[PDB]
Design an enzyme around this catalytic site. Structure first.
Site, PDB file in Angstrom:
ATOM      1  CG  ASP B   7     100.893  72.866 -79.533  1.00 58.75           C
ATOM      2  OD1 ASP B   7     100.297  71.967 -80.162  1.00 58.75           O
ATOM      3  OD2 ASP B   7     101.111  72.795 -78.322  1.00 58.75           O
ATOM      4  CE  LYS B  68      96.433  67.562 -82.724  1.00 61.16           C
ATOM      5  NZ  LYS B  68      97.466  68.337 -81.971  1.00 61.16           N
ATOM      6  CD  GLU B 172     101.171  67.534 -81.450  1.00 60.62           C
ATOM      7  OE1 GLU B 172     101.058  66.682 -80.541  1.00 60.62           O
ATOM      8  OE2 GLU B 172     100.209  67.910 -82.163  1.00 60.62           O
ATOM      9  CG  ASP B 196     102.965  65.659 -75.441  1.00 60.31           C
ATOM     10  OD1 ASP B 196     102.103  65.995 -74.609  1.00 60.31           O
ATOM     11  OD2 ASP B 196     103.095  66.236 -76.533  1.00 60.31           O
TER      12      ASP B 196
HETATM   13  N1  LIG Z   1     100.233  73.676 -63.333  1.00 62.18           N
HETATM   14  C1  LIG Z   1      99.566  72.629 -63.868  1.00 62.18           C
HETATM   15  N2  LIG Z   1      99.365  71.509 -63.147  1.00 62.18           N
HETATM   16  C2  LIG Z   1      98.716  70.433 -63.633  1.00 62.18           C
HETATM   17  N3  LIG Z   1      98.230  70.410 -64.869  1.00 62.18           N
HETATM   18  C3  LIG Z   1      98.326  71.489 -65.687  1.00 62.18           C
HETATM   19  C4  LIG Z   1      99.025  72.684 -65.237  1.00 62.18           C
HETATM   20  N4  LIG Z   1      99.005  73.568 -66.265  1.00 62.18           N
HETATM   21  C5  LIG Z   1      98.345  72.973 -67.297  1.00 62.18           C
HETATM   22  N5  LIG Z   1      97.970  71.737 -66.944  1.00 62.18           N
HETATM   23  C6  LIG Z   1      97.223  70.772 -67.766  1.00 62.18           C
HETATM   24  O1  LIG Z   1      97.769  70.523 -69.070  1.00 62.18           O
HETATM   25  C7  LIG Z   1      96.650  70.182 -69.936  1.00 62.18           C
HETATM   26  C8  LIG Z   1      96.763  70.909 -71.256  1.00 62.18           C
HETATM   27  O2  LIG Z   1      98.111  70.628 -71.669  1.00 62.18           O
HETATM   28  P1  LIG Z   1      98.636  71.116 -73.091  1.00 62.18           P
HETATM   29  O3  LIG Z   1      99.890  70.325 -73.399  1.00 62.18           O
HETATM   30  O4  LIG Z   1      98.585  72.606 -72.990  1.00 62.18           O
HETATM   31  O5  LIG Z   1      97.452  70.725 -74.099  1.00 62.18           O
HETATM   32  P2  LIG Z   1      97.331  69.877 -75.466  1.00 62.18           P
HETATM   33  O6  LIG Z   1      97.305  68.476 -74.930  1.00 62.18           O
HETATM   34  O7  LIG Z   1      95.968  70.381 -75.870  1.00 62.18           O
HETATM   35  O8  LIG Z   1      98.460  70.119 -76.433  1.00 62.18           O
HETATM   36  C9  LIG Z   1      95.394  70.527 -69.177  1.00 62.18           C
HETATM   37  O9  LIG Z   1      94.945  69.323 -68.571  1.00 62.18           O
HETATM   38  C10 LIG Z   1      95.864  71.383 -68.049  1.00 62.18           C
HETATM   39  O10 LIG Z   1      95.055  71.235 -66.906  1.00 62.18           O
END
Ligand SMILES: Nc1ncnc2c1ncn2[C@@H]1O[C@H](COP(=O)(O)OP(=O)(O)O)[C@@H](O)[C@H]1O
EC number: 3.6.4.10
Lengths: 92, 383
Positions: B7, B68, B172, B196
């Site tokens: 990813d 990205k 995705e 998402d």
């Molecule tokens: N336990 C949690 N509670 C709230 N938000 C979270 C938690 N764990 C991760 N996040 C949030 O998810 C986001 C990143 O999500 P992710 O799907 O990993 O990234 P991307 O959008 O880069 O694919 C960040 O804002 C992070 O703070």
């Protein structure tokens, strides 16, 4: 359907014999396919030849290229049977 | 041996591998199963992932992120020009192609966006190699469903530069649906909604599934809505508190505000499974220790409008897909922000108590599915 029965009969008779599958793949390909020249046993004797032709076959039927296409379901089927054929060939 | 799923995310990247019957989502050397899509350049080293993210305050102009958003784009793209204003690093024009200009080891350097994304990818590649004890080459890499050919080709190019052979570029929300085996079910076509909410972007896609074949019927969302924004609503809450307690504005202060943002992201995660979190910063501004508290109720209140507003793109996706909400058969929770309890409730209520697919860490779901697909596109998964 007639297209799926074709491939499922093809797999059945050829007994996961890579050479037999390669030398007859042109009979199951979707109408429209131009990227594949029929290959005789003359070009499938040595493991070099099997390999070289196998790597040419999987490109034609790759499920990634086939994504969205009307034949997608058949590309997948042939891909998978060839992968199994080849792994049986490697194990020999 | 194995092919991996990656990813390649706006804010975080995650790598998984299908191996010995299961998908393992692989932790990095710091123990983390996702990895910041950050590249930092200092006097002495090129930093990737956490080490890059952790130093963004002492070195803001040379810590690249959000590549990205530049990938597959012309410099004269509206989106490039809009976004540039928001970044502390410099983006230059190389004959109609965006580059990022940085200071690395005393010298000025520029990189193409696929080169930066290649660095993230190399990092992810090493993470998988450290776990597997061998070299990784073959990978499936994921992209947003709305990505065009130029963006997809640029993501594939990033893999090649990372020394990877890219078996496929897949979408995705499709990966996430593969993670759930939603395609391994007999019967009439299924309507699947992928909700998402990552760190920078919000994506809603609706997908049809029949005979294992996927089509994207509609997509919606906001390319500038994610967990970062909820972090912001928190920073300013505390900028205001700090001011009242101390009669100081930490708002002029770029490093103070960055340091508080980290404190804030950390507490927000704690708030997903606890009902209060502690903030603890040594010498935040002109020698002042900033210690404080926030509740979930309050966090939610500061974000009430952005939480609730994630339902508009859902409705919008349905009306483009020409579907009423009851015609959705599976709903899938993806992105690390979907962990926020209030987000969970608001989507479920919206779907009239219908149960949500979330048993798989939502920030790992995309990588999960890419891992499944990488095995399949190899022959590591038969029958
Ligand atoms: N336990 C949690 N509670 C709230 N938000 C979270 C938690 N764990 C991760 N996040 C949030 O998810 C986001 C990143 O999500 P992710 O799907 O990993 O990234 P991307 O959008 O880069 O694919 C960040 O804002 C992070 O703070």
């Amino acid at each position: 359907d007639p297209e799926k029965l074709k491939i499922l009969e093809w797999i059945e008779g050829k007994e996961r014999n890579i050479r037999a599958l390669l030398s007859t793949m042109h009979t199951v390909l979707w109408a429209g396919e131009t990227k594949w020249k029929p290959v005789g046993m003359a070009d499938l004797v040595t493991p070099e030849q099997v390999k070289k032709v196998y790597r040419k076959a999987v490109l034609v039927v790759h499920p990634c290229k086939a994504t969205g296409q009307p034949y997608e379901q058949y590309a997948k089927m042939i891909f998978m049977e060839l992968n199994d054929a080849w792994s049986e060939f490697e194990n020999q | 041996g194995p092919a991996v799923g990656i990813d390649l995310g706006t804010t975080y990247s995650c790598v998984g591998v299908f191996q010995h019957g299961k998908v393992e989502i692989i932790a990095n050397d710091q123990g983390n199963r996702t990895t910041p899509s950050y590249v930092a350049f200092t006097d002495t080293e090129r930093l990737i992932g956490d080490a890059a993210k952790n130093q963004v305050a002492m070195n803001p102009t040379n810590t690249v992120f959000d590549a990205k958003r530049l990938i597959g784009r012309r410099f004269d793209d509206a989106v490039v020009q809009s976004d540039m204003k928001h970044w502390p690093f410099m983006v230059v024009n190389d004959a109609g192609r965006p580059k990022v200009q940085v200071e690395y080891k005393g010298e000025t350097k520029s990189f193409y966006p696929e080169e930066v994304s290649s660095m993230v990818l190399t990092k992810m590649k090493e993470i998988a190699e450290a776990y597997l004890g061998k070299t990784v080459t073959n990978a499936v890499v994921t992209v947003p469903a709305y990505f065009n050919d130029s963006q997809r080709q640029a993501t594939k190019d990033a893999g090649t530069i990372a020394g990877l052979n890219v078996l496929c570029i897949i979408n995705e929300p499709t990966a996430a649906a593969i993670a759930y085996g939603l395609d391994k079910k007999v019967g009439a076509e299924r309507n699947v909604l992928i909700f998402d909410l990552g760190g920078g972007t919000f994506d809603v896609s609706i997908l049809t599934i029949e005979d294992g074949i996927f089509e994207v019927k509609s997509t919606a969302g906001d390319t500038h809505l994610g967990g970062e924004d909820f972090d912001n609503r928190m920073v300013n809450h505390f900028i205001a508190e700090f001011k009242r307690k101390h009669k100081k504005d930490i708002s002029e202060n770029k490093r103070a505000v960055r340091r508080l943002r980290t404190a804030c992201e950390r507490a927000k995660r704690t708030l997903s499974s606890s009902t209060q979190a502690s903030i603890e910063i040594d010498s935040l501004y002109e020698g002042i220790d900033f210690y404080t508290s926030i509740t979930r109720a309050r966090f939610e209140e500061l974000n009430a409008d952005l939480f609730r507003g994630t339902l508009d793109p859902v409705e919008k996706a349905l009306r483009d897909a020409k579907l009423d909400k009851s015609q959705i058969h599976d709903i899938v929770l993806v992105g690390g922000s979907t962990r926020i309890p209030k987000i969970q409730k608001l989507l479920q209520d919206f779907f009239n108590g219908k149960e949500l697919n979330k048993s798989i860490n939502p920030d790992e779901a995309v990588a999960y599915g890419a891992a499944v697909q990488a095995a399949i596109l190899s022959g590591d998964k038969s029958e």
